[PDB]
Design a protein around this ligand. Sequence first.
Ligand SMILES: CCCCCCCCCCCCCC(=O)OC[C@H](COP(=O)(O)OCC(O)COP(=O)(O)OC[C@@H](COC(=O)CCCCCCCCCCCCC)OC(=O)CCCCCCCCCCCCC)OC(=O)CCCCCCCCCCCCC
Ligand code: BCL
Ligand SMILES: CC[C@H]1c2cc3[nH]c4c(c3C)C(=O)[C@H](C(=O)OC)c4c3nc(cc4[nH]c(cc(n2)[C@@H]1C)c(C(C)=O)c4C)[C@@H](C)[C@@H]3CCC(=O)OC/C=C(\C)CCC[C@H](C)CCC[C@H](C)CCCC(C)C
Ligand SMILES: CC[C@H]1c2cc3[nH]c4c(c3C)C(=O)[C@H](C(=O)OC)c4c3nc(cc4[nH]c(cc(n2)[C@@H]1C)c(C(C)=O)c4C)[C@@H](C)[C@@H]3CCC(=O)OC/C=C(\C)CCC[C@H](C)CCC[C@H](C)CCCC(C)C
Ligand SMILES: COC(C)(C)C/C=C/C(C)=C/C=C/C(C=O)=C/C=C/C(C)=C/C=C/C=C(C)/C=C/C=C(\C)CC/C=C(C)/C=C/C=C(\C)C(=O)O
Ligand SMILES: COC(C)(C)C/C=C/C(C)=C/C=C/C(C=O)=C/C=C/C(C)=C/C=C/C=C(C)/C=C/C=C(\C)CC/C=C(C)/C=C/C=C(\C)C(=O)O
Ligand SMILES: COC(C)(C)C/C=C/C(C)=C/C=C/C(C=O)=C/C=C/C(C)=C/C=C/C=C(C)/C=C/C=C(\C)CC/C=C(C)/C=C/C=C(\C)C(=O)O
Ligand SMILES: COC(C)(C)C/C=C/C(C)=C/C=C/C(C=O)=C/C=C/C(C)=C/C=C/C=C(C)/C=C/C=C(\C)CC/C=C(C)/C=C/C=C(\C)C(=O)O
Ligand SMILES: COC(C)(C)C/C=C/C(C)=C/C=C/C(C=O)=C/C=C/C(C)=C/C=C/C=C(C)/C=C/C=C(\C)CC/C=C(C)/C=C/C=C(\C)C(=O)O
Ligand SMILES: COC(C)(C)C/C=C/C(C)=C/C=C/C(C)=C/C=C/C(C)=C/C=C\C=C(C)\C=C\C=C(C)\C=C\C=C(C)\C=C\CC(C)(C)OC
Ligand SMILES: CCCCCCCCCCCCO[C@@H]1O[C@H](CO)[C@@H](O[C@H]2O[C@H](CO)[C@@H](O)[C@H](O)[C@H]2O)[C@H](O)[C@H]1O
Ligand SMILES: CCCCCCCCCCCCO[C@@H]1O[C@H](CO)[C@@H](O[C@H]2O[C@H](CO)[C@@H](O)[C@H](O)[C@H]2O)[C@H](O)[C@H]1O
Lengths: 170, 60, 56, 60, 60, 60, 60, 60, 55, 39, 39, 39, 39, 39, 39, 62, 176, 273
Amino acid sequence: MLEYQNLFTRVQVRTVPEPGIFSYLAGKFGDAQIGPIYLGWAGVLSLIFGFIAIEIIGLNMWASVGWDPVEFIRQLPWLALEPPPPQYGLRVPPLNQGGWYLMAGFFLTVSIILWWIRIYRRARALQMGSHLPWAFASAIFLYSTFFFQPLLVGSWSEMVPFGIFPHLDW
Amino acid sequence: MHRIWLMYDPRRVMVALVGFLAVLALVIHFVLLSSQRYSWIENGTLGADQAPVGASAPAA
Amino acid sequence: MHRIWLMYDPRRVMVALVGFLAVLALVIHFVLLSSQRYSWIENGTLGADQAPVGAS
Amino acid sequence: MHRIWLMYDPRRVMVALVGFLAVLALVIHFVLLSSQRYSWIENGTLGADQAPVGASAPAA
Amino acid sequence: MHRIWLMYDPRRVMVALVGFLAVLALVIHFVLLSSQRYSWIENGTLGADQAPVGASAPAA
Amino acid sequence: MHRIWLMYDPRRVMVALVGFLAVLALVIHFVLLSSQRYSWIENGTLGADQAPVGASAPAA
Amino acid sequence: MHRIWLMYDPRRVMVALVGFLAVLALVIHFVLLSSQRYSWIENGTLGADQAPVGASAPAA
Amino acid sequence: MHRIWLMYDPRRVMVALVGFLAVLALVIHFVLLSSQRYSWIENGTLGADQAPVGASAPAA
Amino acid sequence: PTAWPVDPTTGQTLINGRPVVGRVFIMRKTDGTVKYPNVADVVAHEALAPLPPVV
Amino acid sequence: GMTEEEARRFHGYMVTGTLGYVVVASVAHFLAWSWRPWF
Amino acid sequence: GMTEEEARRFHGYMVTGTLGYVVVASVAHFLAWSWRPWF
Amino acid sequence: GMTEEEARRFHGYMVTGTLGYVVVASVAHFLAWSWRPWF
Amino acid sequence: GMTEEEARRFHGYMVTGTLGYVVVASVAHFLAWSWRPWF
Amino acid sequence: GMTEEEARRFHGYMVTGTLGYVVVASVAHFLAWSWRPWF
Amino acid sequence: GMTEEEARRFHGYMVTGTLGYVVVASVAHFLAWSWRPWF
Amino acid sequence: MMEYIDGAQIALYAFWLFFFGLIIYLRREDKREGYPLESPQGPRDGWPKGAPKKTYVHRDHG
Amino acid sequence: SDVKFVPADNYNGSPIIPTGNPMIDGVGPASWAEDRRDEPDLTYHGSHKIVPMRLDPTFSIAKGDPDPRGLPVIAADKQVAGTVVELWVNRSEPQVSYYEVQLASGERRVLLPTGYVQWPNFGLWGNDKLLVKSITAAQFANVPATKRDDQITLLEEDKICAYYAGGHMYAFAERS
Amino acid sequence: AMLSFEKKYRVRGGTLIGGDLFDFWFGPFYVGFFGVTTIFFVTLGTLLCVWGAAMGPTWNLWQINIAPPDLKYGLGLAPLREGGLWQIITLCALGAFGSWALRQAEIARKLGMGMHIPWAYGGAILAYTTLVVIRPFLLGAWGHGFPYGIFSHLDWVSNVGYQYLHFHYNPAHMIAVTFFFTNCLALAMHGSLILSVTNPPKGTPTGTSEQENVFFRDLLGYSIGAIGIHRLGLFLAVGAAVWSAICIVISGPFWTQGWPEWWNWWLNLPIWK
Ligand SMILES: CCCCCCCCCCCCCC(=O)OC[C@H](COP(=O)(O)OCC(O)COP(=O)(O)OC[C@@H](COC(=O)CCCCCCCCCCCCC)OC(=O)CCCCCCCCCCCCC)OC(=O)CCCCCCCCCCCCC
Ligand code: BCL
Ligand SMILES: CC[C@H]1c2cc3[nH]c4c(c3C)C(=O)[C@H](C(=O)OC)c4c3nc(cc4[nH]c(cc(n2)[C@@H]1C)c(C(C)=O)c4C)[C@@H](C)[C@@H]3CCC(=O)OC/C=C(\C)CCC[C@H](C)CCC[C@H](C)CCCC(C)C
Ligand SMILES: CC[C@H]1c2cc3[nH]c4c(c3C)C(=O)[C@H](C(=O)OC)c4c3nc(cc4[nH]c(cc(n2)[C@@H]1C)c(C(C)=O)c4C)[C@@H](C)[C@@H]3CCC(=O)OC/C=C(\C)CCC[C@H](C)CCC[C@H](C)CCCC(C)C
Ligand SMILES: COC(C)(C)C/C=C/C(C)=C/C=C/C(C=O)=C/C=C/C(C)=C/C=C/C=C(C)/C=C/C=C(\C)CC/C=C(C)/C=C/C=C(\C)C(=O)O
Ligand SMILES: COC(C)(C)C/C=C/C(C)=C/C=C/C(C=O)=C/C=C/C(C)=C/C=C/C=C(C)/C=C/C=C(\C)CC/C=C(C)/C=C/C=C(\C)C(=O)O
Ligand SMILES: COC(C)(C)C/C=C/C(C)=C/C=C/C(C=O)=C/C=C/C(C)=C/C=C/C=C(C)/C=C/C=C(\C)CC/C=C(C)/C=C/C=C(\C)C(=O)O
Ligand SMILES: COC(C)(C)C/C=C/C(C)=C/C=C/C(C=O)=C/C=C/C(C)=C/C=C/C=C(C)/C=C/C=C(\C)CC/C=C(C)/C=C/C=C(\C)C(=O)O
Ligand SMILES: COC(C)(C)C/C=C/C(C)=C/C=C/C(C=O)=C/C=C/C(C)=C/C=C/C=C(C)/C=C/C=C(\C)CC/C=C(C)/C=C/C=C(\C)C(=O)O
Ligand SMILES: COC(C)(C)C/C=C/C(C)=C/C=C/C(C)=C/C=C/C(C)=C/C=C\C=C(C)\C=C\C=C(C)\C=C\C=C(C)\C=C\CC(C)(C)OC
Ligand SMILES: CCCCCCCCCCCCO[C@@H]1O[C@H](CO)[C@@H](O[C@H]2O[C@H](CO)[C@@H](O)[C@H](O)[C@H]2O)[C@H](O)[C@H]1O
Ligand SMILES: CCCCCCCCCCCCO[C@@H]1O[C@H](CO)[C@@H](O[C@H]2O[C@H](CO)[C@@H](O)[C@H](O)[C@H]2O)[C@H](O)[C@H]1O
């Protein structure tokens, strides 16, 4: 859309070599590598744990429409991976009755924590204050109450289902 | 008196006047069209003694 | 008296007066139009003995 | 007393006064028009022996 | 005691004072008007023997 | 004791004190006017024996 | 022990202390006013043996 | 042990300590006040054999 | 209990034994609304508590 | 900026147009009154 | 700004226009009162 | 800024307009009182 | 800033106005008490 | 800020105003008490 | 910032003020206890 | 055994005391620029008093 | 009296009135931060952040954009104020920060912050001239100077931007 | 009182109405003509809210409730004690909110700023006007407005939601929620990044646009740039209110069934009907 400053209306510019003394540097601000999107050990581990979490959620949704790929797309916002039955309380439930749910919840939670480590390490390496990691920690605090409140009332059945419309039903 | 048009730009006044009258006319027509007595699209062919009248005062 | 117009530009006051009076007139009409006694569009043909009174 | 007009600019004290009187007059009229005794648009034609008077419940 | 006006600009004190008194007066009138006993717009014509009184403690 | 006024600017302290005492006074009045015993606008004419009193311990 | 006033500015501490004591007092008064036993505005005229007591262990 | 006051600014540690102790004291007082056995504002005058006790094991 | 006495001579309402000029109405707040006293009073207007589940 | 003679001729049209508008509205009201009077 | 003789000229118009408006409004109330008195 | 002479001149109108406004309000209150007393 | 002479002049007005207002409010309470006492 | 003579002078008024306020409040409490005791 | 002898002087007021306050609170608890003991 | 006082109410006033402490802190930070205020009868600090104006240490490149 | 402005009257909260030309003196929306540090801004590695493009061959116009150099600049009074001789770029966040304008019918060259330029048809088509809506072609002669032509200080940035900012109020006014 | 750099900026000019008459300050506040009209509407509308509380059942701040009229009054003014007072306060509120935006335009003009702030606030005014003017007008009664009361308007929100059985399924509402949530994330990121370069760990040089650019690119995988993050915040925040206004105006005037059954069109696409 049109804009009330010339700055990138027209005559945008190309640094054909890199900026940082479009293009990007390959170097360091101190010890922090500047080229690729940063991961480190925690970023790599976070992607593995988070991938398996998302993969478990998707495969349970797809199994719930009987592996039908047409219904998998057609019904996608109604599909869910669902918490255990209430009678189990905090005990380990059957695999098809919430056992996959708690597994995906565990792998997702570890993946989130490892992503916080990544951001914390990167802020230190770029020689920045820790304001962003503590901001992200406040979001993780709310997320964690979807584990702790079910724990405090004594049943995993009270957890949020993984699913677009189902989590809004919850 | 014509010197009033030195106080205000007539080009501006006429635009304000037409706007005011256009909005006012639409408001009055909408008020009447929404009434019972003057809902003339549905009931305009009724004679004056057949047209609705609002309620009177109670007898006592 | 006239020195009031040395403080307030009469060109501007006269516009603000028209704006004030137009809104005030509209408010008073819409109040009356919505009352029982003065709902003249529905009941204006009633005689003053027939017109509603808000007794209860 | 006139020296108050040296403390404050009379041009804008008068705006504040006229604005105060407008708000106060409108508030008092709306307060009365809300009341039962002084809802004068509906009941203004009643004589004082017919005008509403509020009381508490007779508390038997 | 007049040296209080060396400490505070009187032009600011009058503004604070008028602001305070206007709010306080309006608070008290609306509080009274919200009461039963002093709802004077509805009940002002009642005599002091007739005006409401809030409930006692239980009679025994 | 008076050297407190060298530690703090009296013009700032007096404004703060006035603000505190105004808010505190309004709080206490609103607390009392919220009560049953001291709802004085409705019940201030009641004698001390007639005024409400909170429940005692139930006698065994 | 007085060297604490080298470590902290006393004119900040004295205001911080006044703030602390103000909040602490208001908390304790409002907690007590919320109780049954010590809601003194309603029940303050009760004698000590008449004042409410929380339930004992039920004897059985 | 005193090297702790070189490792960290005592002004920071003092505020951190007082903050910790105040928060801990408040947590414990309200936890007790919320309990049955130690709700001292309502039941503080009960003797120790009259104070509540939690449920024992079944069947001895 | 629902209305003050009326003087048979004049149809005129008597409050605490003395006439009022005008038509007396019993004052109420907006639409007769009344502040809820407490949870127990709210609950006393409701149905009783639900029965225990059948498991 | 309008001159006083431009204002002089302009006002004549403004009066004429206002009078014409009031005339048409006056007939419109008298027709409406004959069809369904409001008092 | 405006000269005191322009202010004295305008004051003549403003007083006359204000009072003429009040006169027209007073007649409108006379008609409304004759039709349906509010006291 | 206005002189203390202009202040006295302005204050004379301000008192007079206040009095006139209070007079009108007083008659309006006594009309209202005679129609429907509030005490 | 303000002269002590000017502060003393203003104080004369400020005290007088304050006490005048309290006197008018005293009469208002006298009337209200005679109409409907609150104790 | 203030000289110590100004601080001394101010403190005399401050204590006198505080005493006057406390006196009025003391009378207000004794009026309240004799009307409706809270213990 | 304060000299050590300023800190010395302030500390004397500060300790005296704290102890005087605790004394007034002690009388308040004496009165409160005699009216309605909490143990 | 307190009827009226409950854990949610306790938590809420704990938050209010924190929150008003935060607003005081934020208003001190708002005053690091453009304060003390100018007026007739001299400088004005508002309330709370502002934190001091803040110097920033540049990175060296020599 | 060199003082740039005087009160409109003695009451509290009254406006000030400029004594001289407000665009030159820097009053109201023409004013600038007068205590601002008179040094160049620096990149992370400490080079000058804003420089003429001829001093850093890393930078070039994105292919298929117009190069604005050599275009005429059309001022608020539709007069041709000059022609673009050079671009100045921000090296920390690659963009054009200023046009440099060779003044028509004058000796001098002046900077022009790109926030105050617009293209005809907002750049979509045409692009044969530049429009500066905020000041007249006469006022272009008084645009503040930089002490050097290879660098600009933070104070000089503030002065130049404040000049074009004031124009929308003062360009068509006798207050000069 | 004035900021230590302020006096220089307090010129005349930039007013949209009234010339020099109202062009002055009252303490920190600029007045102007729409300052005067703001205070008029604020005072009248507030005092009528106080009157609404006085004639209502209680003074408790949370419980005060100035309700709109019954639907049977349609587009007329009800009796004041029966919702007419809510209508007058609504006219005051519209007058106040409009005056406030136009006063902001005078302030921005006087400082040589763009008009962005008045237009951004226009997005809030649009949502309000939709709730109390446009949707009630399309439904044919002012009684469809929400009551003025701190918790009683939340009862209205609750009941309007359940008028459509499961309001989460409203498609425009899902978009509006996504803008509100993404806005809060973006605000946390932008706030954190600026603070973390300007307040580094002790004994570390003040950071640079390059460091925040690098960190932002590590977070989102692309560089938004300094102008872009403020454009994005404004787009998200204002877009949230615009999509809010859409989601409520479609509920009732246009869609009247439950919101879950709106999604029937997706289930019936011919590729998979
Ligand atoms: C719930 C989650 C979200 C909730 C979200 C909540 C967000 C809250 C944002 C608003 C807070 C900031 C407001 C502010 O600072 O205004 C400036 C003003 C004056 O200080 P200054 O600006 O530094 O100095 C100027 C002044 O000294 C001299 O100026 P001048 O001579 O030209 O003009 C005259 C003076 C007179 O003072 C006043 O008229 C203001 C008095 C009322 C202030 C109330 C502030 C709000 C308190 C809210 C906290 C709580 C109060 C109970 O100055 C002025 O004219 C200044 C006019 C400022 C008008 C601001 C109005 C803001 C209204 C906010 C309403 C919020 C409603 C929610 O400041 C103050 O008066 C003190 C305010 C301090 C912050 C409140 C902290 C409360 C902590 C707890 C109690 C502390 C007890 C000691
Ligand atoms: C500079 C003055 C000193 C001081 C000097 C004295 C002296 C000297 C005596 C006391 C005495 C007493 N002090 Mg002392 N006292 C001080 C501060 C305090 C504080 C406090 C909060 O700081 C408290 C609670 C007390 C409390 C007390 C009581 C335990 C006791 C008698 C009542 C009394 O004085 O009432 C509270 C009064 C005050 C707080 C005001 C200050 C003290 C007043 C002026 C003492 C007057 C009475 C005294 C007997 C007169 C002396 C002549 C006699 C003929 C012997 N003091 C200050 C710091 N105090 C007396 C004692 O030991 O009795 C057993 C005594 O002889
Ligand atoms: C202050 C409160 C707000 C908030 C703040 C906030 N959120 C944040 C942050 C902050 C400050 C971050 O810094 C952080 C972030 O990274 O932001 C970009 C984050 C974040 N907020 C997120 C989401 C989010 N925030 C939300 C809300 C909020 N965030 C609040 C409104 C919501 C809502 C409203 O529901 C959501 C959904 C994320 C985008 C992000 C945290 C990302 C994260 O933890 O990711 C974990 C990793 C995975 C889930 C795995 C992904 C797997 C890939 C898809 C697989 C690809 C294959 C893979 C490569 C295979 C492995 C091979 C290996 C060899 C590598
Ligand atoms: C773009 C969309 C978002 C937005 C933006 C926004 N709001 C803004 C601005 C902007 C850009 C301003 O510039 C403007 C401002 O000046 O802020 C300081 C403002 C503002 N946003 C405000 C509030 C606000 N914004 C909200 C929402 C939003 N603001 C959106 C999420 C909300 C919500 C969701 O509840 C609130 C409460 C104000 C702080 C301020 C506008 C101040 C103003 O208009 O002042 C003049 C009016 C008064 C001081 C009082 C008027 C009183 C009335 C006459 C009577 C009361 C009637 C009212 C309807 C009663 C309601 C009772 C409630 C319990 C229901
Ligand atoms: C529900 O009931 C509710 C609604 C509530 C009750 C109602 C309440 C209210 C408050 C009603 C208010 C009514 C009102 C109040 O003012 C109504 C006022 C009406 C008015 C004033 C109408 C005026 C009309 C004037 C017209 C049309 C002029 C036309 C002029 C023309 C055509 C010529 C133009 C110029 C030309 C051609 C060129 C000239 C030469 C030039 C330029 C040259 O030569 O150069
Ligand atoms: C139940 O409902 C609620 C609402 C609650 C009930 C309560 C309501 C309340 C409280 C109402 C209050 C109302 C009020 C209060 O004061 C109302 C006050 C009204 C007033 C003041 C009206 C004034 C009108 C003045 C007019 C029209 C002037 C016209 C002038 C004209 C035409 C001349 C123009 C000049 C010319 C031509 C010369 C130019 C120069 C020239 C040519 C030259 O120089 O050559
Ligand atoms: C629901 O019940 C609730 C509401 C709750 C109950 C409570 C209500 C409360 C608390 C009410 C409080 C009311 C109040 C309190 O004080 C009310 C105070 C009212 C006052 C003071 C009114 C004053 C009016 C003054 C007027 C009109 C002046 C007019 C002046 C004129 C016309 C002259 C103008 C100048 C001219 C012509 C020339 C100048 C010369 C110049 C320039 C020259 O020569 O240069
Ligand atoms: C529901 O029940 C609740 C409400 C809850 C219960 C609780 C209530 C509470 C807590 C109430 C508190 C009340 C209170 C507390 O303080 C009340 C205090 C009130 C006070 C002090 C009022 C003072 C009024 C003073 C006035 C009007 C002054 C007028 C001055 C005039 C006219 C002169 C001006 C100058 C002139 C003319 C010339 C200058 C010359 C100059 C400059 C020169 O010549 O140079
Ligand atoms: C939930 O619990 C609930 C229910 C709420 C219950 C619990 C309530 C609680 C905890 C209450 C606590 C109350 C409290 C605690 O301390 C209360 C403390 C109150 C205090 C200290 C009051 C002090 C008042 C002092 C005044 C008025 C002084 C006036 C001074 C004047 C007039 C003189 C001014 C100077 C002059 C004239 C000289 C100028 C010369 C100059 C300039 C010169 O010479 O230069
Ligand atoms: C072939 O690959 C395919 C095609 C399958 C890949 C495609 C996958 C797809 C299409 C995936 C779609 C995913 C969707 C749409 C997901 C939607 C998710 C939503 C909307 C989720 C919303 C909320 C969820 C919440 C709040 C869940 C919270 C869970 C928590 C906090 C669980 C914590 C569990 C813990 C900490 C530990 C558990 C282990 C035990 C209990 C044993 O403790 C040690
Ligand atoms: C608002 C619409 C309702 C009708 C309003 C007007 C109705 C009454 C109109 C009466 C007309 C005659 O009224 C009279 O007109 C003359 C000009 O002719 C005005 O005269 C004014 O202008 C003339 C010429 O510019 C000056 O010389 C004079 O000093 C000045 O007073 C008078 O001040 C006014 O009193
Ligand atoms: C003292 C604060 C007021 C509230 C406390 C009320 C209880 C005390 C009653 C007054 C008794 C005398 O109290 C006493 O006052 C003197 C000065 O007068 C203070 O004296 C303080 O300042 C003086 C100089 O002025 C120093 O020489 C001294 O070393 C220092 O302590 C004492 O610290 C305090 O103990």
